[PDB]
Structure formats: structure tokens, C-alpha cells
């Protein structure tokens, strides 16, 4: 229930994004880690960014939420950093990840965005 999660996310969704990665990890361009993720956002374009809800110090990803209205990119939350690590192709975890080129998920990446724009309100 952290304080840097600015809204609830459904059983699905949180599951939908998680796979949105796996089809960009091959077909598209992806970057993992909170730094490369942060870069990708100020780098002005990464199409969607993903933030685990289990993180501690819970502030190491706290900047992405403000940063993303700044650069005006959508963000979403998966529940587990580890699920997201193996999702992004790494044996360790990921506090967050950014989608650079959607690849196959282009459509999927797209739809997920608009579901987010409602409940950020």
C-alpha cells in the first residue's frame, strides 16, 4: 500500500503490462533499471513506463510519478519488482522499466495507455 502509488490497479492491467514487456523484449527496444528508466523519460521519449509496488527504500522510484507528468508519459504499477525483472529478461529484479519501442505490443502498449489516463484523474 505505498505512498508513491497514486492509484489502484486491477488484477488484469497489472498483468497486461507485465506481458507488454515480454513482446517488446524481443520485437522492440526496452531498457531496465530505475536509472535507464529515468534517463528514458528525460530523454524525452519512452512510450510507457512500469513501476513495481514493492520497493524500499520506497523512495528510490518515488521520482518517476512526478517526472512523468513533466515529460507527459503514462506510467503504471506491477505488484512485484521480481515478476518485472524476469519479465524484462533478467534473473535479478527491476524496480521499474521503460518501453522504448513497443514492437509487437504497439497496439497493446497503446490500449494500456488510455486505461491509465482515466484513473490518473
Amino acid at each position: 500500500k505505498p505512498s508513491y502509488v497514486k492509484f489502484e490497479v486491477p488484477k488484469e492491467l497489472a498483468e497486461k503490462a507485465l506481458q507488454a514487456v515480454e513482446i517488446a523484449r524481443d520485437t522492440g527496444k526496452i531498457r531496465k533499471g530505475t536509472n535507464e528508466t529515468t534517463k528514458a523519460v528525460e530523454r524525452g521519449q519512452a512510450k510507457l513506463v512500469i513501476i513495481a509496488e514493492d520497493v524500499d527504500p520506497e523512495e528510490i522510484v518515488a521520482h518517476l510519478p512526478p517526472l512523468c507528468e513533466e515529460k507527459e508519459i503514462p506510467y503504471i504499477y506491477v505488484p512485484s519488482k521480481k515478476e518485472l525483472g524476469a519479465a524484462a529478461g533478467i534473473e535479478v529484479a527491476a524496480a521499474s522499466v521503460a518501453i522504448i519501442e513497443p514492437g509487437k505490443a504497439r497496439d497493446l502498449v497503446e490500449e494500456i495507455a488510455m486505461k491509465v489516463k482515466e484513473l490518473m484523474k
Partner: protein, 366 residues
């Protein structure tokens, strides 16, 4: 023997019997802010004096600095933390203060707190950016004014330029001594100057090629020196404040790399927030803004670090490891900065130990 309180300073013998007690003449929180930190104040000093002419030569306080300052004042003093005094004030407080004792412990307690804490907020990170830019501007001028005073007063006593290379020393000469004939043992040794120094000097003074100076041409070279001495003082006032204000800005950052180096990074970043949002890859190379440009331009070997070079562990270790300890530190700043920006809770001690330990790793593998 002696423990403090919210009312006055108290003295007990080995039986707990109350010897003498001095109520605070000043504002209780103002005396306390001093005494607790370990510094010695009027009512305490005036106290153990009235104690010295009692039959008490023997002293023990609750703080190791109180004891230092007391014996360095001639009084035999020792440190036992909970001691016969504090155990008595903090045990049966009503005996001393009456039944509202807690209420009093309240008025002062919150009073000392609102005195120790900075009000309001909100650009105080941008203020630390002045204090810092200011702080090192006051360096560029102290170096000018000192270059002058040197060239100037060297007309009268040219030799002293190389016998006193330490600027604050040269400057206390001109200020305190004045005319070259005012030189003599007693005053030279009060400058803290050494022995060989006190001996040379005169050997180059007593026979000099310097021009003569009237008490008029001297007083104005003294007003130059006396001014630089005001700038040295303003420097300290800028340091004390960078320190004191990082407590409200980036306690974590301050506890991690030091109040000063942390103000630097806040400075390169443009504010605490701009420093928060930074990928630790950026924070690594902060300050290297020039050597960075010639990376993305001439494709040169990237700077392994910026301002953070100042970190002891990086600059006193072989170049073998500098790069690794570089980002090893950059990472922990990234976090301290984000904690600092968002909550301000103090996690630095975990951050340090995670970093000390990563560093041994880096060392062990090379």
C-alpha cells in the same frame, strides 16, 4: 557531582544530597542549547566557582566535552553518564520542580525545539546554493585582497612574503603587528608562530631593504589586512550556515558526503528536486561538465567522476578502482537525494554501511 535540568544547574555529593543549585539567568532553552552540546556557559561556570570555595575540588559531569572544558579551566573533572545528579533530577523531578514539573519540562522542551528548528521552508535549498556560490566567491576575493596586501606591505618589509606563506598568518601579522618595528618576541609567539620562525623574521627584519612607512601609510595597509580578516570571518559564517541548513535540506546527503560536497551537488543540479530526478549516472559525473562535453564531442574517454572526486574513498584510492567506487557512491546519493527531497527521514546510516561494504568488495577483488 553535576547535572542539568529545565530550571537550573544542580550539584550533588556522593550521597545525592543537594549542594548548591543555580537557576538560569538567561532563557532556559538558550543556556540548555549550549550545555547539552557540551559547551560551558555562565551559570555553570559561576556555579562550580561558588563550589570551588566550598571544599569541593572534585568534579564529574554527564558529558565528555563539559569535562574537557572544565579541566582545561583548571578544575579536575571526570565523566560518568548516569551519575548521582542526573539520576536524582530525572528520578524525583517533583522534589525539585513541583507537581507541574512535566508541564515545565514541556514549556522549555518545545521552546528549545522551535529554537533549534528552521521555520517554514521552500527555497532553502536554493539558499544553500547561494551560500555555496557565495562561499566560494568570498574565496576569490580573499585571494585578491591577500595578493595586494602581500605586494603592498612588501614595500615596507619585503622579506616577510616568503617567511609567511600561510595567508591567515601573514594577514595576522599586518593586522596585529603593524609597523615593522613593532616586532619582538612576545607578539610573534602570540601569532602562534613557531620558533625558527620567530628567529628568522627578526634576522631578516633587523636588517631589511624595505622602504619606510609613516603611521599614516601603515594604518591603511592595516585596514586592508583587517578587512581580509573580516572576510575570513564571513567565510566561517558561510560554512556554519551551509552546515546548519543542510539539516533542513538534505540531512541524508549531508550525513553521507558532508554538508559541503552535498551543497555542491545540489548546486550543479540546480536544486534539491533537480538533483532528485537525476539518474545516478548523471550524479556520478556532476561538475565534470567540461570533460563531459569532449566525450560526446571528440569521443574521448568519459570522466569517471565530477565533484564527487572530493569523496575521500575515491581520491585516496588507486585509479584501478576509482570508476567503480564512483558509481558505487553515485547510487547512494541518488537515494539519499530522493529521500531528502520527499520525506527527509534519516536513513543515512544504512546508506553508509551499504556503501562502506560495497567498497571493501571493490577493494578485495583488485
Amino acid at each position: 557531582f553535576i547535572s542539568e535540568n529545565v530550571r537550573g544547574i544542580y550539584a550533588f555529593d556522593e550521597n545525592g544530597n543537594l549542594i548548591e543549585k543555580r537557576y538560569f539567568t538567561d532563557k532556559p532553552e538558550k543556556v540548555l542549547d549550549q550545555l547539552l552540546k557540551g559547551e560551558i556557559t555562565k551559570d555553570l561556570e559561576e556555579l562550580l566557582n561558588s563550589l570551588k570555595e566550598k571544599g569541593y575540588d572534585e568534579f564529574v559531569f554527564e558529558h565528555p566535552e563539559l569535562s574537557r572544558r572544565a579541566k582545561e579551566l583548571g578544575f579536575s573533572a571526570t565523566t560518568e553518564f548516569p551519575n548521582i545528579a542526573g539520576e536524582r533530577l530525572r528520578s524525583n523531578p517533583e522534589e525539585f520542580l513541583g507537581e507541574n514539573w512535566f508541564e515545565e519540562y514541556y514549556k522549555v522542551g518545545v521552546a528549545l525545539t522551535r529554537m533549534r528548528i528552521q521555520e517554514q521552508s521552500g527555497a532553502r535549498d536554493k539558499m544553500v546554493i547561494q551560500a555555496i556560490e557565495a562561499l566560494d566567491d568570498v574565496d576569490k576575493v580573499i585571494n585578491l585582497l591577500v595578493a595586494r596586501l602581500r605586494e603592498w606591505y612588501s614595500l615596507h618589509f619585503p622579506e616577510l612574503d616568503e617567511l609567511l606563506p600561510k595567508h591567515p598568518q601573514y594577514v595576522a601579522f599586518v593586522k596585529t603587528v603593524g609597523h615593522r618595528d613593532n616586532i619582538n618576541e612576545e607578539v610573534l609567539r602570540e601569532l602562534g608562530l613557531s620558533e625558527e620562525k620567530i628567529k628568522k623574521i627578526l634576522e631578516a627584519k633587523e636588517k631589511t631593504m624595505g622602504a619606510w612607512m609613516d603611521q599614516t601609510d601603515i594604518e591603511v595597509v592595516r585596514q586592508l589586512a583587517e578587512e581580509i580578516d573580516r572576510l575570513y570571518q564571513l567565510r566561517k559564517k558561510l560554512e556554519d550556515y551551509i552546515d546548519r541548513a543542510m539539516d533542513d535540506v538534505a540531512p541524508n546527503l549531508k550525513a553521507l558526503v558532508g554538508a559541503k560536497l552535498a551543497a555542491r551537488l545540489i548546486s550543479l543540479a540546480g536544486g534539491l528536486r533537480e538533483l532528485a530526478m537525476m539518474p545516478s549516472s548523471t550524479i556520478q559525473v556532476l561538475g565534470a561538465e567540461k570533460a563531459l562535453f569532449r566525450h560526446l564531442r571528440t569521443g574521448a574517454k568519459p570522466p569517471k567522476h565530477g565533484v564527487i572526486y572530493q569523496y575521500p574513498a575515491i581520491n585516496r584510492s588507486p585509479w584501478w578502482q576509482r570508476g567503480k567506487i564512483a558509481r558505487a557512491l553515485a547510487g547512494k546519493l541518488a537515494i539519499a537525494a530522493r529521500v531528502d527531497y520527499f520525506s527527509g527521514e534519516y536513513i543515512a546510516e544504512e546508506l553508509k554501511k551499504e556503501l562502506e561494504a560495497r567498497i571493501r568488495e571493490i577493494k578485495e577483488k583488485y
